[PDB]
Design a protein around this nucleic acid. Structure first.
Ligand SMILES: [Mg+2]
Lengths: 29, 172, 70
RNA sequence: GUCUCGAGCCCUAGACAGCCGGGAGGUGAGCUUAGAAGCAGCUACCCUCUAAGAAAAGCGUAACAGCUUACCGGCCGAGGU
Protein backbone atom coordinates (compact mmCIF):
# COMPACT_ATOMS: atom_id res chain seq x y z
CA UNK A 1 0.00 0.00 0.00
CA UNK A 2 1.82 3.13 -1.29
CA UNK A 3 2.27 5.77 1.40
CA UNK A 4 0.78 8.55 -0.73
CA UNK A 5 -2.47 6.58 -0.92
CA UNK A 6 -2.75 6.13 2.86
CA UNK A 7 -1.87 9.78 3.43
CA UNK A 8 -4.46 10.84 0.85
CA UNK A 9 -7.23 8.78 2.46
CA UNK A 10 -6.49 10.71 5.66
CA UNK A 11 -6.77 14.16 4.06
CA UNK A 12 -10.11 13.09 2.57
CA UNK A 13 -11.51 11.77 5.87
CA UNK A 14 -10.36 15.07 7.40
CA UNK A 15 -12.45 17.25 5.06
CA UNK A 16 -15.46 14.91 5.29
CA UNK A 17 -15.70 15.42 9.07
CA UNK A 18 -15.31 19.21 8.83
CA UNK A 19 -9.77 8.86 -7.12
CA UNK A 20 -13.28 7.48 -6.65
CA UNK A 21 -11.79 4.50 -4.81
CA UNK A 22 -10.08 6.77 -2.28
CA UNK A 23 -13.32 8.68 -1.75
CA UNK A 24 -15.26 5.45 -1.17
CA UNK A 25 -12.47 4.44 1.20
CA UNK A 26 -12.84 7.68 3.19
CA UNK A 27 -16.61 7.22 3.31
CA UNK A 28 -16.36 3.70 4.75
CA UNK A 29 -14.45 5.41 7.57
CA UNK B 1 -8.71 -22.12 -23.42
CA UNK B 2 -12.34 -21.24 -24.10
CA UNK B 3 -14.01 -17.98 -25.13
CA UNK B 4 -17.78 -17.54 -25.35
CA UNK B 5 -19.42 -14.92 -27.55
CA UNK B 6 -23.02 -14.00 -26.75
CA UNK B 7 -24.80 -13.48 -30.07
CA UNK B 8 -26.97 -10.29 -30.31
CA UNK B 9 -30.77 -10.61 -30.32
CA UNK B 10 -30.90 -9.17 -33.83
CA UNK B 11 -28.63 -12.03 -35.03
CA UNK B 12 -28.91 -15.73 -35.99
CA UNK B 13 -25.81 -17.94 -36.10
CA UNK B 14 -25.88 -21.40 -37.66
CA UNK B 15 -22.75 -23.52 -38.22
CA UNK B 16 -21.83 -26.65 -40.19
CA UNK B 17 -18.35 -28.23 -40.24
CA UNK B 18 -15.66 -25.54 -40.31
CA UNK B 19 -17.98 -22.89 -41.75
CA UNK B 20 -19.97 -20.36 -39.71
CA UNK B 21 -22.93 -18.48 -41.12
CA UNK B 22 -24.14 -15.32 -39.39
CA UNK B 23 -27.51 -13.88 -40.43
CA UNK B 24 -28.97 -10.52 -39.46
CA UNK B 25 -31.28 -7.77 -40.70
CA UNK B 26 -28.43 -6.31 -42.77
CA UNK B 27 -27.61 -9.62 -44.44
CA UNK B 28 -25.59 -12.79 -43.95
CA UNK B 29 -21.91 -13.76 -43.93
CA UNK B 30 -20.35 -17.21 -44.01
CA UNK B 31 -16.73 -17.90 -43.12
CA UNK B 32 -14.37 -20.82 -42.79
CA UNK B 33 -12.56 -20.81 -39.44
CA UNK B 34 -10.04 -23.60 -39.80
CA UNK B 35 -7.02 -23.99 -37.50
CA UNK B 36 -5.43 -27.03 -35.78
CA UNK B 37 -7.31 -28.10 -32.66
CA UNK B 38 -9.54 -25.02 -32.41
CA UNK B 39 -13.20 -25.98 -32.17
CA UNK B 40 -15.80 -23.35 -32.96
CA UNK B 41 -19.38 -24.29 -32.12
CA UNK B 42 -22.84 -22.76 -31.63
CA UNK B 43 -24.22 -23.65 -28.19
CA UNK B 44 -27.74 -22.24 -28.44
CA UNK B 45 -27.29 -18.51 -27.81
CA UNK B 46 -23.47 -18.27 -27.74
CA UNK B 47 -20.60 -19.07 -30.10
CA UNK B 48 -17.78 -21.03 -28.47
CA UNK B 49 -14.13 -20.94 -29.55
CA UNK B 50 -12.11 -23.47 -27.58
CA UNK B 51 -8.97 -25.61 -27.68
CA UNK B 52 -6.93 -27.94 -25.47
CA UNK B 53 -3.72 -26.27 -26.65
CA UNK B 54 -2.70 -22.97 -25.11
CA UNK B 55 0.50 -22.14 -27.03
CA UNK B 56 1.32 -18.71 -28.53
CA UNK B 57 0.30 -19.85 -32.00
CA UNK B 58 -3.06 -21.25 -30.91
CA UNK B 59 -3.84 -18.22 -28.75
CA UNK B 60 -3.03 -16.00 -31.71
CA UNK B 61 -5.70 -17.58 -33.88
CA UNK B 62 -8.24 -17.89 -31.06
CA UNK B 63 -8.07 -14.11 -30.72
CA UNK B 64 -8.37 -13.75 -34.49
CA UNK B 65 -11.40 -16.02 -34.58
CA UNK B 66 -13.08 -13.99 -31.85
CA UNK B 67 -12.63 -10.65 -33.61
CA UNK B 68 -13.75 -12.24 -36.87
CA UNK B 69 -17.01 -13.46 -35.36
CA UNK B 70 -17.69 -10.19 -33.53
CA UNK B 71 -17.25 -8.36 -36.85
CA UNK B 72 -19.82 -10.59 -38.54
CA UNK B 73 -22.27 -9.74 -35.75
CA UNK B 74 -21.68 -6.05 -36.38
CA UNK B 75 -21.92 -6.54 -40.14
CA UNK B 76 -25.27 -8.30 -40.26
CA UNK B 77 -26.78 -5.66 -37.96
CA UNK B 78 -25.10 -2.23 -38.03
CA UNK B 79 -23.07 -2.97 -41.16
CA UNK B 80 -19.64 -1.93 -42.38
CA UNK B 81 -18.96 1.39 -44.06
CA UNK B 82 -15.92 3.09 -45.58
CA UNK B 83 -16.04 6.68 -46.80
CA UNK B 84 -14.05 7.96 -49.77
CA UNK B 85 -13.22 11.22 -51.52
CA UNK B 86 -12.11 11.63 -55.12
CA UNK B 87 -9.36 14.21 -55.60
CA UNK B 88 -7.86 15.57 -58.82
CA UNK B 89 -5.78 18.57 -59.90
CA UNK B 90 -5.71 19.24 -63.65
CA UNK B 91 -7.72 16.36 -65.14
CA UNK B 92 -11.37 15.93 -64.07
CA UNK B 93 -11.64 12.26 -63.09
CA UNK B 94 -14.89 10.49 -63.98
CA UNK B 95 -15.70 7.86 -61.34
CA UNK B 96 -18.73 5.63 -62.04
CA UNK B 97 -20.27 2.29 -60.99
CA UNK B 98 -20.85 0.41 -64.24
CA UNK B 99 -22.56 -2.89 -63.54
CA UNK B 100 -20.79 -4.84 -60.79
CA UNK B 101 -17.58 -2.79 -60.94
CA UNK B 102 -16.46 0.77 -60.27
CA UNK B 103 -14.89 2.42 -63.32
CA UNK B 104 -12.58 5.44 -63.34
CA UNK B 105 -12.25 7.37 -66.59
CA UNK B 106 -9.83 10.06 -67.75
CA UNK B 107 -7.58 9.38 -64.76
CA UNK B 108 -4.61 11.71 -64.95
CA UNK B 109 -5.78 12.32 -68.52
CA UNK B 110 -5.62 8.69 -69.66
CA UNK B 111 -7.67 7.50 -72.64
CA UNK B 112 -8.16 3.99 -71.27
CA UNK B 113 -10.54 3.49 -68.31
CA UNK B 114 -9.25 1.93 -65.10
CA UNK B 115 -11.62 -0.52 -63.46
CA UNK B 116 -11.98 -2.95 -60.55
CA UNK B 117 -14.63 -5.53 -59.69
CA UNK B 118 -16.61 -5.13 -56.48
CA UNK B 119 -16.23 -7.98 -53.98
CA UNK B 120 -19.32 -9.85 -52.84
CA UNK B 121 -22.58 -8.08 -52.03
CA UNK B 122 -20.64 -4.92 -51.28
CA UNK B 123 -22.49 -1.76 -52.32
CA UNK B 124 -20.63 1.25 -53.70
CA UNK B 125 -22.66 4.46 -53.54
CA UNK B 126 -21.39 7.60 -55.24
CA UNK B 127 -22.55 11.17 -54.61
CA UNK B 128 -20.57 13.59 -56.75
CA UNK B 129 -17.14 13.66 -55.11
CA UNK B 130 -17.97 11.33 -52.23
CA UNK B 131 -18.09 7.53 -52.18
CA UNK B 132 -19.43 5.10 -49.60
CA UNK B 133 -18.52 1.42 -49.65
CA UNK B 134 -20.78 -0.72 -47.47
CA UNK B 135 -21.81 -4.28 -46.73
CA UNK B 136 -22.14 -6.98 -44.03
CA UNK B 137 -18.85 -8.77 -44.82
CA UNK B 138 -16.00 -6.58 -43.57
CA UNK B 139 -13.61 -8.66 -45.66
CA UNK B 140 -15.33 -7.73 -48.93
CA UNK B 141 -16.00 -4.11 -47.96
CA UNK B 142 -12.48 -3.49 -46.68
CA UNK B 143 -10.93 -4.85 -49.88
CA UNK B 144 -13.37 -3.16 -52.26
CA UNK B 145 -12.55 0.19 -50.68
CA UNK B 146 -8.82 -0.63 -50.77
CA UNK B 147 -9.10 -1.74 -54.40
CA UNK B 148 -10.60 1.62 -55.30
CA UNK B 149 -7.71 3.54 -53.72
CA UNK B 150 -5.18 1.12 -55.21
CA UNK B 151 -6.82 1.54 -58.61
CA UNK B 152 -5.15 4.94 -59.00
CA UNK B 153 -1.71 3.60 -58.03
CA UNK B 154 1.10 5.52 -59.74
CA UNK B 155 4.69 4.20 -59.70
CA UNK B 156 6.34 6.17 -62.51
CA UNK B 157 5.95 9.73 -61.16
CA UNK B 158 6.45 11.63 -57.88
CA UNK B 159 3.23 11.06 -55.94
CA UNK B 160 3.87 14.24 -53.92
CA UNK B 161 3.16 16.25 -57.10
CA UNK B 162 0.77 13.87 -58.90
CA UNK B 163 -1.77 13.39 -56.10
CA UNK B 164 -4.88 12.60 -58.19
CA UNK B 165 -6.93 9.68 -56.91
CA UNK B 166 -9.76 8.31 -54.78
CA UNK B 167 -8.80 8.03 -51.11
CA UNK B 168 -10.18 6.34 -47.98
CA UNK B 169 -11.49 9.15 -45.77
CA UNK B 170 -13.43 7.30 -43.09
CA UNK B 171 -12.86 3.82 -41.69
CA UNK B 172 -15.30 1.99 -39.36
CA UNK C 1 -6.90 45.82 -17.26
CA UNK C 2 -4.09 45.93 -14.69
CA UNK C 3 -0.55 45.99 -16.23
CA UNK C 4 1.88 43.02 -15.98
CA UNK C 5 3.63 42.10 -12.72
CA UNK C 6 7.20 42.61 -14.00
CA UNK C 7 6.40 46.29 -14.62
CA UNK C 8 4.74 47.06 -11.26
CA UNK C 9 8.04 46.01 -9.67
CA UNK C 10 10.25 48.24 -11.84
CA UNK C 11 8.31 51.33 -10.69
CA UNK C 12 8.97 51.17 -6.94
CA UNK C 13 12.42 49.69 -7.59
CA UNK C 14 13.89 52.42 -9.78
CA UNK C 15 15.51 49.90 -12.13
CA UNK C 16 14.49 48.97 -15.68
CA UNK C 17 16.68 46.21 -17.16
CA UNK C 18 16.88 42.95 -15.21
CA UNK C 19 20.07 40.89 -15.02
CA UNK C 20 22.19 38.54 -17.11
CA UNK C 21 21.80 36.02 -14.28
CA UNK C 22 18.82 35.99 -11.83
CA UNK C 23 19.61 35.80 -8.09
CA UNK C 24 23.32 35.57 -8.98
CA UNK C 25 23.32 39.28 -9.91
CA UNK C 26 21.12 41.24 -7.48
CA UNK C 27 19.82 44.40 -9.16
CA UNK C 28 16.67 45.92 -7.64
CA UNK C 29 15.30 45.75 -4.08
CA UNK C 30 12.03 45.73 -2.15
CA UNK C 31 10.47 45.52 1.30
CA UNK C 32 7.48 43.73 2.86
CA UNK C 33 5.20 46.79 2.80
CA UNK C 34 6.11 47.38 -0.86
CA UNK C 35 5.01 43.86 -1.80
CA UNK C 36 1.86 44.23 0.32
CA UNK C 37 0.70 47.07 -1.95
CA UNK C 38 1.22 45.16 -5.22
CA UNK C 39 -0.81 42.34 -3.65
CA UNK C 40 -3.81 44.65 -3.18
CA UNK C 41 -3.92 45.52 -6.89
CA UNK C 42 -4.23 42.12 -8.60
CA UNK C 43 -7.41 40.26 -7.62
CA UNK C 44 -8.96 38.75 -10.78
CA UNK C 45 -5.45 38.14 -12.17
CA UNK C 46 -4.48 36.00 -9.16
CA UNK C 47 -6.25 32.77 -8.15
CA UNK C 48 -5.44 33.09 -4.42
CA UNK C 49 -8.20 33.59 -1.85
CA UNK C 50 -6.09 35.11 0.94
CA UNK C 51 -3.83 38.13 0.58
CA UNK C 52 -1.06 36.00 2.10
CA UNK C 53 -0.84 33.76 -0.97
CA UNK C 54 -1.32 36.80 -3.22
CA UNK C 55 2.05 38.01 -1.97
CA UNK C 56 3.64 34.59 -2.56
CA UNK C 57 2.65 34.79 -6.23
CA UNK C 58 4.09 38.28 -6.67
CA UNK C 59 7.24 37.08 -4.89
CA UNK C 60 8.03 34.56 -7.60
CA UNK C 61 9.35 36.86 -10.30
CA UNK C 62 11.16 39.14 -7.85
CA UNK C 63 14.02 36.95 -6.55
CA UNK C 64 14.42 35.47 -10.05
CA UNK C 65 15.61 38.89 -11.26
CA UNK C 66 17.75 40.29 -8.47
CA UNK C 67 15.06 41.86 -6.30
CA UNK C 68 16.29 41.29 -2.73
CA UNK C 69 13.78 41.78 0.08
CA UNK C 70 14.36 43.30 3.54
C1' G D 1 9.63 -17.90 -34.58
C1' U D 2 8.42 -20.96 -30.55
C1' C D 3 9.16 -23.93 -25.91
C1' U D 4 11.32 -24.01 -20.86
C1' C D 5 13.62 -21.80 -16.28
C1' G D 6 15.07 -17.89 -12.90
C1' A D 7 15.35 -12.82 -10.74
C1' G D 8 13.55 -7.37 -9.78
C1' C D 9 9.51 -3.97 -9.76
C1' C D 10 4.04 -2.72 -10.41
C1' C D 11 -1.20 -4.54 -9.39
C1' U D 12 -8.87 -5.00 -7.41
C1' A D 13 -6.55 1.34 -2.54
C1' G D 14 -7.38 -1.01 -10.23
C1' A D 15 -1.60 -2.38 -12.64
C1' C D 16 0.17 -2.45 -18.65
C1' A D 17 -2.33 -0.70 -23.14
C1' G D 18 -6.19 1.73 -25.33
C1' C D 19 -10.42 5.45 -25.44
C1' C D 20 -12.66 10.20 -23.20
C1' G D 21 -12.17 14.46 -20.24
C1' G D 22 -8.57 17.84 -17.86
C1' G D 23 -4.02 19.58 -19.21
C1' A D 24 -5.16 25.89 -15.45
C1' G D 25 -3.28 31.05 -13.15
C1' G D 26 0.54 35.36 -11.50
C1' U D 27 3.11 35.83 -16.92
C1' G D 28 3.14 36.63 -23.47
C1' A D 29 9.05 34.34 -16.72
C1' G D 30 14.23 37.79 -17.03
C1' C D 31 18.09 38.70 -19.91
C1' U D 32 18.96 38.94 -25.53
C1' U D 33 15.69 41.54 -29.34
C1' A D 34 12.09 45.40 -34.19
C1' G D 35 10.26 40.67 -32.09
C1' A D 36 11.00 35.71 -29.53
C1' A D 37 5.34 34.68 -25.92
C1' G D 38 7.35 25.86 -23.45
C1' C D 39 10.56 25.16 -27.46
C1' A D 40 16.83 30.71 -32.16
C1' G D 41 20.30 32.05 -27.44
C1' C D 42 22.10 33.23 -22.12
C1' U D 43 20.53 32.63 -16.61
C1' A D 44 17.31 30.91 -13.87
C1' C D 45 13.63 27.12 -13.25
C1' C D 46 10.77 30.21 -8.57
C1' C D 47 4.41 30.07 -6.09
C1' U D 48 -1.09 30.15 -6.49
C1' C D 49 -5.34 27.16 -7.70
C1' U D 50 -5.82 21.96 -7.29
C1' A D 51 -7.39 15.84 -8.31
C1' A D 52 -3.34 16.96 -11.88
C1' G D 53 -0.66 20.50 -15.23
C1' A D 54 7.07 21.76 -16.75
C1' A D 55 9.97 29.12 -16.02
C1' A D 56 7.98 22.81 -20.88
C1' A D 57 9.74 16.69 -23.36
C1' G D 58 8.35 16.69 -29.05
C1' C D 59 6.62 18.61 -33.70
C1' G D 60 4.76 23.27 -35.49
C1' U D 61 4.84 29.49 -36.69
C1' A D 62 8.65 34.97 -39.37
C1' A D 63 6.88 35.56 -34.29
C1' C D 64 1.96 34.15 -32.77
C1' A D 65 -1.62 30.35 -33.32
C1' G D 66 -2.05 25.27 -33.80
C1' C D 67 -1.01 19.42 -32.10
C1' U D 68 0.49 16.23 -28.64
C1' U D 69 4.41 14.74 -23.91
C1' A D 70 4.80 15.12 -19.15
C1' C D 71 1.58 15.09 -15.01
C1' C D 72 -4.43 14.12 -12.99
C1' G D 73 -9.29 12.22 -13.23
C1' G D 74 -12.73 8.63 -15.80
C1' C D 75 -14.22 4.18 -18.65
C1' C D 76 -12.34 -0.81 -18.69
C1' G D 77 -10.82 -5.14 -15.51
C1' A D 78 -6.32 -8.90 -14.51
C1' G D 79 -2.55 -9.74 -14.63
C1' G D 80 1.55 -6.58 -16.12
C1' U D 81 6.48 -4.83 -16.84
MG1 LIG E 1 11.70 9.86 -63.90
Amino acid sequence: IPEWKQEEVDAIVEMIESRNTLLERALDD
Amino acid sequence: PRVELEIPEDVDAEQDHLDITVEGDNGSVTRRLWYPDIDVSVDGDTVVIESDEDNAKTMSTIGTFQSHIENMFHGVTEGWEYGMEVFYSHFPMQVNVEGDEVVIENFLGEKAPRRTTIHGDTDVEIDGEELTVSGPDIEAVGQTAADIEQLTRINDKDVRVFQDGVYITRKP
Amino acid sequence: GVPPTAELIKDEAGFETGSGEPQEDFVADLSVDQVKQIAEQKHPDLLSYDLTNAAKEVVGTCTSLGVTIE
